Amino acid sequence: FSKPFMTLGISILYRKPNGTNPGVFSFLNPLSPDIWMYVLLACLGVSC
Amino acid sequence: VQNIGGIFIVLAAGLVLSVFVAVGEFLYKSKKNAQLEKRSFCSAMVEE
Ligand SMILES: CCCCCCCC/C=C/CCCCCCCC(=O)O[C@@H](COC(=O)CCCCCCCCCCCCCCC)COP(=O)([O-])OCC[N+](C)(C)C
Ligand SMILES: CCCCCCCC/C=C/CCCCCCCC(=O)O[C@@H](COC(=O)CCCCCCCCCCCCCCC)COP(=O)([O-])OCC[N+](C)(C)C
Ligand SMILES: *[C@@H]1O[C@H](CO)[C@@H](O[C@@H]2O[C@H](CO)[C@@H](O)[C@H](O)[C@H]2NC(C)=O)[C@H](O)[C@H]1NC(C)=O
Ligand SMILES: CC(C)CCC[C@@H](C)[C@H]1CC[C@H]2[C@@H]3CC=C4C[C@@H](O)CC[C@]4(C)[C@H]3CC[C@]12C
Ligand SMILES: CC(C)CCC[C@@H](C)[C@H]1CC[C@H]2[C@@H]3CC=C4C[C@@H](O)CC[C@]4(C)[C@H]3CC[C@]12C
Ligand SMILES: O=S1(=O)NCN(C2CC2)c2ccc(F)cc21
């Protein structure tokens, strides 16, 4: 061989995992979708 | 409902407690008006 014109290295080629976006109704996520009903049935209940 | 959970229990506790003290104040104003007219049914029914 001659003396190298480019430096190498064995590495791993693999797909990027998809960065699924936090869609614009993201702030409802910190409570479960039945708890949002249970708060709604509370403030419809306790008010009654 | 597994995570928070117990605030709905104490919401169910205080309101049932509040209906108890609501009758106790109703029977108390039947009691201070009991020295006016009759024993209960005067100040009960007029305030019922
Ligand atoms: C904190 C104090 C209490 C406040 C009172 C609240 C009590 C009354 C509330 C009652 C219920 C409120 C919403 C809860 C249920 C929907 C949310 C949900 O489940 O997520 C769903 C998504 O969401 C959506 O994509 C569409 C559904 C949301 C519609 C907008 C609701 C209006 C909020 C206004 C509320 C009233 C405002 C005025 C209030 C006077 C589930 O979908 P996912 O598959 O899990 O995720 C999608 C994935 N992605 C995003 C990547 C695509
Ligand atoms: C006294 C006691 C009560 C008596 C009993 C009475 C009976 C009541 C019993 C009720 C039983 C419960 C049944 C509902 C279950 C829903 C959960 C769910 O998974 O579905 C979805 C709820 O996401 C929504 O779309 C919610 C609807 C919009 C939110 C706005 C509502 C409040 C508005 C403001 C309130 C003003 C407050 C004013 C206060 C003065 C979440 O999943 P998803 O992925 O989003 O699905 C999309 C569905 N879609 C395609 C059709 C959109
Ligand atoms: C990013 O890569 C692909 C592109 O959508 C997703 O892989 C899919 O996964 C579903 C089930 O989860 C299957 O249909 C296949 O395995 C894939 N679909 C296709 C069309 O190949 C992957 O879920 C995405 N998201 C990540 C990695 O978060
Ligand atoms: C005042 C009223 C209108 C509020 C809403 C209704 C309440 C009483 C109901 C609706 C759903 C109910 C919950 C449903 C499921 C469970 C899980 C169980 O392992 C313990 C009880 C518990 C945690 C219940 C507690 C009471 C509850 C929160
Ligand atoms: C615990 C229950 C069962 C019995 C006690 C009820 C209490 C909360 C009730 C009974 C008598 C009530 C009082 C009766 C009269 C007055 C005078 C008024 O100008 C202000 C309110 C005030 C001061 C009331 C406050 C509430 C009161 C103290
Ligand atoms: O000075 S060299 O012998 N010949 C030139 N090259 C490079 C192309 C970068 C490199 C690259 C890495 C080396 F270790 C040596 C050399």
Resolution (A): 6.7
Per DSSP, the residues of A17-45 read PP-----S-GGGTTS-TTHHHHHHHHHHH
Q: Which residue is listed with tokens 């029977």?
A: B27
**Pairwise CA distance, residues B8 & B1, whole Å:** 9
Nearest to B31 by CA among B20, B42, B21: B42
Nearest to B2 by CA among A36, A40, A35: A35
Atom 22 of ligand 3, nearest CA residue: A18
Pairwise CB contact (< 8 Å): A46 & B11: yes
Determine whether the shortest distance from the Cβ of A4 to ligand 6 is under 6 A: yes
Quick one: tokens of A37?
Answer: 């009903």
* B10 φ/ψ angles, rounded to the nearest 5 degrees: -75, -20
User: Closest ligand to A39 CA?
Assistant: 1
Nearest to B27 by CA among B11, B10, B39: B39
Nearest to A31 by CA among B9, B3, B12: B3
